[PDB]
Amino acid sequence: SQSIIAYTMSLGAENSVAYSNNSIAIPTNFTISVTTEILPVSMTKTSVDCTMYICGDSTECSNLLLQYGSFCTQLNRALTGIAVEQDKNTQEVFAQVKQIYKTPPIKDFGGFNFSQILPDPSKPSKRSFIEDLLFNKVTLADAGFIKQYGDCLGDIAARDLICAQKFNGLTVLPPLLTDEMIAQYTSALLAGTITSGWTFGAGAALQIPFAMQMAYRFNGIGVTQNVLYENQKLIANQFNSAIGKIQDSLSSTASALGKLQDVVNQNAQALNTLVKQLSSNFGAISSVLNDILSRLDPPEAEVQIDRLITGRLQSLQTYVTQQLIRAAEIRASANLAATKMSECVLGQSKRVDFCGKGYHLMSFPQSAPHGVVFLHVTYVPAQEKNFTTAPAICHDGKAHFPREGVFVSNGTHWFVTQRNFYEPQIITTDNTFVSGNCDVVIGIVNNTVYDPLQPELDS
């Protein structure tokens, strides 16, 4: 009884924010959420042989293609320009630092578990458990870029894509940086983020306790660092559970990496299509170059072969154009990944939703096939409560404004607390500064401002 249904697309659950001049909502509790953002860095490096692709194993045809001249050279000049920048895209993202950092053998992070994001020497290539998942959820070509001629010759796999591309002159150039090395760049960038904080991107790596690192990344998002060490046991548990949810997200759902799988698919589809382009007749009597040479004289073959050359060359010009446009898209995502490597992983991004939803703390790079996966640690307010608020306070007749934080009331007494976490404090002259009077500020209320020096005068 299942059928196709047609519905108006929902915009999401509608939420009505209750708004009033005297109301504010401050989170009393929060959650540490690790969000997975996945960006393509590099794309498949392809070197096409345009003498081989157009004229297969043919002297008569190749002599005709040489009349076309620079066409074969200018296509490879653009494909090489891609192959160079794809190694440059990977160079700009994964290596921002000259030094390779490693975590010390003794691990005390303050409860934070990083064994999932840290490399595992047990594997043949040193990689994190997540980078092992990232490599297993993206299907690539055969292991290694060396495919023997006898492997294709001795056994012909029925409809084998990679051999057929190579016998047509389509070669996949290996990236300059192996996945084993990329895992060691992400390891160096992660080991510096863990041990040295954000200081390793602006200079020499300066070790700081990861607790103090968390404390000073709360000062960046506007949360007083005292919130950390009170919740440190919880913040480490909320974080370690969030990393544990990255496993269940990657392992169960294999479509999270589809952005990077699309990079492999489009590169394979474009090469596979380029092989299918050879079955087109181009207006010639046959698409086969050997059928024309075995039938028509060179005068009658040149007419037919030049139709094949023009089409097979335009097919390469189409492919190279598809690659240059796609390489500009991958480079834009690589420049974005290189920006999210610097400003997000290496530093702490003040940019809202640049590292994803929530106030960002630090990001963890993870090597993925033809790309990078940033694990973004974000500060998300969890439990909130409405609180009667006021812009200022009238004590002696002078308006008091918070140096940091807001004025809130629980219905009886007015308290001062920071915006992004609820930590009610007695309103004092150290918390609030004196500006102007009470005849101006709109919504101002009357409240006693405690003076820490007042009890000292009682003695």
Partner 1 sequence: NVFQTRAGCLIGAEHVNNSYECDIPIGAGICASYQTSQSIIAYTMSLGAENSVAYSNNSIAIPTNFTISVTTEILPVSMTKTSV
Ligand X SMILES: *[C@@H]1O[C@H](CO)[C@@H](O)[C@H](O)[C@H]1NC(C)=O
Ligand Y SMILES: *[C@@H]1O[C@H](CO)[C@@H](O[C@@H]2O[C@H](CO)[C@@H](O)[C@H](O)[C@H]2NC(C)=O)[C@H](O)[C@H]1NC(C)=O
Contacts (CB under 6 A) with ligand Y, residues 350-409 = 382, 394
Angstrom CA distances, 276 to 48, 71, 289, 330, stand at 15, 21, 15, 25
Contact between 418 and 222 (Cβ < 8 Å): yes
Close Cβ partners of 418 (under 8 Å, ≥ 6 residues apart): 222, 223, 224, 404, 405, 406
Contact between 120 and 187 (Cβ < 8 Å): no
User: Which 187-216 residues touch its own copies, going by CB under 8 A?
Assistant: 198-199, 201-204, 206-209, 211-212, 215-216
Q: 65 is written with which tokens?
A: 């293609």
Q: Tell me which of 24, 25, 173, 234 binds ligand Y, using CB under 6 A.
A: 234
Q: Is 209 in the site for partner 1 (CB under 8 A)?
A: yes
Q: Is 443 in the site for its own copies (CB under 8 A)?
A: yes
Residue with smaller CB distance to partner 1, 28 or 425: 425
User: Which 24-53 residues touch ligand Y, going by CB under 6 A?
Assistant: 29, 31
Q: Which does 446 bind (CB under 5 to 8 A by kind): partner 1, ligand Y, its own copies, none?
A: ligand Y
Q: Which does 333 bind (CB under 5 to 8 A by kind): partner 1, ligand Y, ligand X, none?
A: partner 1
Q: Which does 245 bind (CB under 5 to 8 A by kind): ligand X, ligand Y, partner 1, none?
A: none
Contact between 135 and 369 (Cβ < 8 Å): yes
Residues ending a continuous segment of the chain before a break (C–N > 2.5 Å): none
Q: Which does 47 bind (CB under 5 to 8 A by kind): ligand X, partner 1, its own copies, none?
A: none
CB count within 10 Å of CB 303 equals 13
Query: Which residues in this chain contact ligand X in the complex, by CB under 6 A?
Result: 18, 21-22, 108, 384-386, 443
Residue with smaller CB distance to its own copies, 168 or 378: 378
Q: Is 237 in the site for ligand Y (CB under 6 A)?
A: yes
User: Which 53-112 residues touch partner 1, going by CB under 8 A?
Assistant: 87, 95, 97-104, 106, 108, 110
Q: Which does 342 bind (CB under 5 to 8 A by kind): its own copies, partner 1, ligand Y, none?
A: its own copies
Q: Tell me which of 107, 295, 357, 413 binds its own copies, using CB under 8 A.
A: 357
Q: Is 332 in the site for its own copies (CB under 8 A)?
A: yes
Q: Which residues of 254-284 are buried (b: 16+ CB within 10 A; e: fewer)?
A: eebbebbbebbebbbebbbebbebbeeebeb
Q: Is 331 in the site for its own copies (CB under 8 A)?
A: yes
Cα torsion angle, 118, 173, 370, 95, sign: positive
Q: What is the smallest separation between the CB atom of 385 and ligand X, expressed in angstroms?
A: 5
Q: Which does 422 bind (CB under 5 to 8 A by kind): partner 1, its own copies, ligand X, none?
A: partner 1
C-alpha atoms less than 13 angstroms from C-alpha of 43 in its C-beta half-sphere: 31
Distance from C-alpha of 27 to C-alpha of 231, rounded to nearest angstrom: 14
Angstrom CA distances, 131 to 121, 321, 366, stand at 13, 32, 6
List residues near ligand Y by CB under 6 A. 29, 31, 107, 113, 115, 234, 237-238, 241, 382, 394, 410-413, 445-446
